[PDB]
Amino acid sequence: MKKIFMMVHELDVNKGGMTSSMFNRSKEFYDADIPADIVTFDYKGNYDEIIKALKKQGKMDRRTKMYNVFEYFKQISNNKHFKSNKLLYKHISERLKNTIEIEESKGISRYFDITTGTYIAYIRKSKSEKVIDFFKDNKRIERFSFIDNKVHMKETFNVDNKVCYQVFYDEKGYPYISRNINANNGAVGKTYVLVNKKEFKNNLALCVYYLEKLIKDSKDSIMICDGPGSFPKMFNTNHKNAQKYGVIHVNHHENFDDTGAFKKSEKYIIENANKINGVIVLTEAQRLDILNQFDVENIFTISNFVKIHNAPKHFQTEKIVGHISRMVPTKRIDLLIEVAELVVKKDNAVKFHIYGEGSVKDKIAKMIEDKNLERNVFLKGYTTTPQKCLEDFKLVVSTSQYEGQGLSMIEAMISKRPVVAFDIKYGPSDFIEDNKNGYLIENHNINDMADKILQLVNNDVLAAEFGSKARENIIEKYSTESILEKWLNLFNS
Amino acid sequence: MKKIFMMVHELDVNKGGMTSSMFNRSKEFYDADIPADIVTFDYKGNYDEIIKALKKQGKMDRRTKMYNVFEYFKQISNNKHFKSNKLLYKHISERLKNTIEIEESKGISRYFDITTGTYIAYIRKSKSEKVIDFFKDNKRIERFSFIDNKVHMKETFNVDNKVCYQVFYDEKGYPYISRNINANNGAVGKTYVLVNKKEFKNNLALCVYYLEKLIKDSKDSIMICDGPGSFPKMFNTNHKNAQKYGVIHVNHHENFDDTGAFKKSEKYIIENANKINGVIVLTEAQRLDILNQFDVENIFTISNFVKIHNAPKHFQTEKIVGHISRMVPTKRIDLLIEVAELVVKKDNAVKFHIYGEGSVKDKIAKMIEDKNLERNVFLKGYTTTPQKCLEDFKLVVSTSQYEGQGLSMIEAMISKRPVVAFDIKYGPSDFIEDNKNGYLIENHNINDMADKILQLVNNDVLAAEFGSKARENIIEKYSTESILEKWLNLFNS
Amino acid sequence: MKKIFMMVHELDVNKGGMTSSMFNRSKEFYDADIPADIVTFDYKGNYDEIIKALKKQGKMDRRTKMYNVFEYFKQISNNKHFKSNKLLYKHISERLKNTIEIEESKGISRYFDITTGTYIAYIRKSKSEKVIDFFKDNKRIERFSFIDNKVHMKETFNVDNKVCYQVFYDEKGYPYISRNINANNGAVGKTYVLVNKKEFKNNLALCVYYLEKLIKDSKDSIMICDGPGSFPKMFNTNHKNAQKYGVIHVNHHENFDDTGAFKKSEKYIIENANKINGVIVLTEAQRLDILNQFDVENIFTISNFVKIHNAPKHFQTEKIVGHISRMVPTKRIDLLIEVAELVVKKDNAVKFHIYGEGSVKDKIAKMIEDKNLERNVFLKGYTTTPQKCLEDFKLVVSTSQYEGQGLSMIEAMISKRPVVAFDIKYGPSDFIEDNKNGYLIENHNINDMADKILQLVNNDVLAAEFGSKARENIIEKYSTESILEKWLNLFNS
């Protein structure tokens, strides 16, 4: 009776392909009678609300549990008291005594001392959530954060109005964990679990202790580490019999670097491959590269499980080119904008839909206006229904520079939509068959990409034939049966 | 029934020609049955004391009222309470409890905690005024400022011992206004009028609201803006029928600049000339310059009203050269010192009297010592009786670089004293007739100025003849009747 | 009936030759029926413990008293109260109320608020001593320092966690002195003697007042200033009849300087020589140099009194080279390490013993490892029995660059151990007779020093003959009778 634990720093709604990956892998293992659950190492007051959201959308399976370090201690504390922390509420109440109130917006109000004139507090009410900012010498010193009129967290601020210390309160209002935050970089330093009256060097120390308490040291206990930052938390555990795996979801080479350097985190995972049960990469291509560059052997290729949903009823006849991604520098949407310009200047009709949000969103938006493509290129924002958006596209495009495998492309192919993409490390090459199910463009060759988009976007028969062969190819190469078989081989060694 | 409101940031005793200008214009309009009053936008605890002073000296007419934004709210607050703010005094009292006192000077005493040794407060008593500086962690945190044993203001200090917040107390000790001060530049940010429980973006916001409440939106209501910084406070009012005028009291070109740049504030006043009832300049010369440089028409020349006092009984026979001015860089007293040196080296007898105070005072004082003119050039300090000092001079001199009109020169001419001055923008050219009532020296030609001073300071008949024709010329050109006529034309349009 | 007062900033255990010098001079004067006592100007909680230590070791004579500025005021305060400062202890007690404790090491524990989670205090217990660090907004604000469960000092900290203010408590727990400390340089600013409710500009001001109160203005009262920094404290006293002497214990030229510059402090002592009773130097050599460089006459040569202890029973036959010094840059142990390398490369047998501690200790330790002399050169750490260590050496060496006289060398010679040293300013030249009782090596000539060490360390007869003539020479030149005679001549003038 095996039981899996998938480590990631945090879970959220706007999240990329790594979380999509974990959720699908969780579903697939639960279907194989192995409970795969997620472990997180961050504080979030509204975690319950988030899980409810992720499960409603169908993104997260209902079966999958989410174990969290703070919640484990909040639980310990909840059960230690019976009466409410009335004292803390009186403490906050007392601070706002002889006060006059000045209104700003709706929820927003500032409180001044009736007798002295001193600025006392700032309160921002928002239905469920409320925030109280207390002041000393006209500078903010603390912030009491509430959810459903109950205090959950307290942050202390420095002279630069930056957090330097946090306190977390249980369901009864009692402090269970408090921790120093480095104001400069925002790094979590000394953690103090108040409930068990024990101190920790930092989150790594705390989470190692957590994992050692959460996971049984059985050979039937499996730790999978998806988050690269989370790796040392798994690596440093005293677990002698428990299985330890590390999954590398990205190109291990340092992004935008010609010096032949590697990503710091990934390098550490790769170097220590032999000291654990195995390091997993998505493409056989990346496996070879890693083996040829490093003196390790424990590297295995296991692709992502593919959710083979049913393909749309009809193909999109209208000239619509799609792109569903995290809006980041490596996805090179700037080059997609430059390709779009070449396309529209040869054919006015074609429309480009760019779903997603991120860092580069504003620069690309500004880039659209200057190039005068406001009527041709639209930033449709983050979707929660990618499958639905895919119906509306004639073809999908990828300007992405670096990739681990590229699920967005796989997803498009599954929903009978051909992909036009730059042949990069790693993934496009693996699933795309140039002039059969899609186009594999030479990396950075924006002019040739633009031409092969015009070719496909005007020929409705090709767009239909390519999209069909694309779905066929994914079902073939990425069979859920064969992928699970690869995992199970590792688990039984 | 017209009523005028003259806007200036503040009123004080040491003040220059702009305040002298406003007071005289106030007297002149009151004599024309139009009440002209002054509006100020700054906090001063002792304002009443200052007005009493200005009215005693005869500088300010007894009829003229001074409306002030803070006093308007202090008034509102005064009337809101009946009992004294005994609580605030107990708050200050309590802070100095188990304290020992150490003496420094007379009024000066420091207070230490008897039980702990902590530095508690610094108190400086001075007959009517008292200041209490409170400390936290051996650093000053607040200053309670008192007048006649009653607290009027409280300042909060940062880590750099700079004011970052102010609170103002009424006649009963209750806080009415509190405001954030930018510690770096000393700029007034968020103003909170505690009495009316309303917040304002800053002093501009607060004063716009004030003016809208103070001034009736009648066509018989007139706003004159003398202070260039005060301009936006007048400009931004919702007043649809009230008349809006801007007076430019200085050379609109940027001081000490060869790039052809303009004074920031003046540029804004000038540019928006057409959007208001009119922008007023003192010289017809400046009017032309402004019209030839900017695309506006609403520029009018109205000189200052001249107080034609009676001229002294006798002329000064003794070799005494005078100068009455704000001691600033534009008045170029450094060049006067260099001229004085040329004069004394040709004639030992001549004495130079330099009344006034300001920025450059110390540098000029140091400059006198090094040039060895300690026995010939004397810095007589600020006078409150310029008319009296003028009796003692044979002639008056002006090294001033930039000028709006130059009243000090006009004043000298009225009191039968010829003026030797650099022909500059703007004013000397207008009233001085070279070799008739004075000398108009080529700007910066210190050698020729020195020569024309020696000429006049040795010839007692010329100094007498010039001074006589000078008084005649001012009575002629600057008739109070004609000036008031110009104003009244604008008001009735 | 003469009475002497020897000024030095502080007394401690690890201390160099200046304190050794003062103690011996104290013993010698007490033997001459003149009580010579030490005056100190620093705060130390454990001073009594230190004196007990110095007197047990026999370093300090039992007769010699140590007058201290803080102790004088602590005494004043002790006698002002009868009941204990129970209030202060309640104040500290109250601060640690609703607190939970977290353990770090043994003594080390941190305290958190049970109701709020705020970090309250840090306590480090150590048998007699205890330190309590209080916090505000997760930053340290104060430190209560205790000895035998009684609070003696309180330090206040800034935002940079640096001391900016100190408070000292008497034997009853009452504050007697409080003072501002410049956080940047650690300089003592405004001193407030709380007991006498009087303020002082700084320690200089306070100590001048102290000395004026401690020392009677009699011609039979003598002030000797050994500490160069302490000089102004003696110089600024209103004493009209009391005798004032300044002793210069070092080379007056600025260390590591080719510009011909002088030590700032020493320069001031030397320049003001004529304004006091006399400036004392140790070598007749330095006297001449000072007289030839400065326009003063009041410079006198008086050597240190030499403690002529009995020489060891037998000479060291084994190849052991010794060095007893403060480990500082001027002692140039880096060159001794370079000499040791030359010696060991010619003779493997020889061992080097380097007693003492200081600045350069770590660099020299690192230097030993790299040169591969870990088996030949050993850093034996600070000794409290130099006489005992001297028995174990065949010869002693000096690489010292700058010196006043160099007692460590004299000490070695007294205990029949020849000295191999660089001929420098000042001292080696005076007592060493090259090729008679030791070797005088040309300064920096490491190769020749190494050769003359090998010569002496292999010839057991020479090492014996030199060491014998060395003891003879010190007894001869540095007779306690003649030295005391020089002092007494100054005192009776």
Ligand SMILES: O=c1ccn([C@@H]2O[C@H](COP(=O)(O)OP(=O)(O)O)[C@@H](O)[C@H]2O)c(=O)[nH]1
């Ligand atoms: O508007 C949306 C909605 C969802 N996703 C999902 O995010 C994943 C992105 O996968 P990819 O392989 O491209 O990796 P990543 O963007 O994390 O680098 C896919 O499953 C998308 O469906 C997205 O990026 N944008």
Ligand SMILES: O=c1ccn([C@@H]2O[C@H](COP(=O)(O)OP(=O)(O)O)[C@@H](O)[C@H]2O)c(=O)[nH]1
């Ligand atoms: O010692 C004194 C006393 C009064 N004033 C008055 O300040 C005004 C200065 O006028 P000016 O035209 O020179 O303009 P400003 O100095 O403000 O630039 C005159 O009315 C002076 O009488 C002065 O400057 N110095």
Ligand SMILES: O=c1ccn([C@@H]2O[C@H](COP(=O)(O)OP(=O)(O)O)[C@@H](O)[C@H]2O)c(=O)[nH]1
């Ligand atoms: O391990 C030890 C023990 C004691 N001392 C003593 O410190 C003095 C140093 O004297 P020196 O003349 O060399 O002057 P300084 O080191 O103060 O410059 C001598 O009396 C030593 O016995 C030392 O330096 N090291």
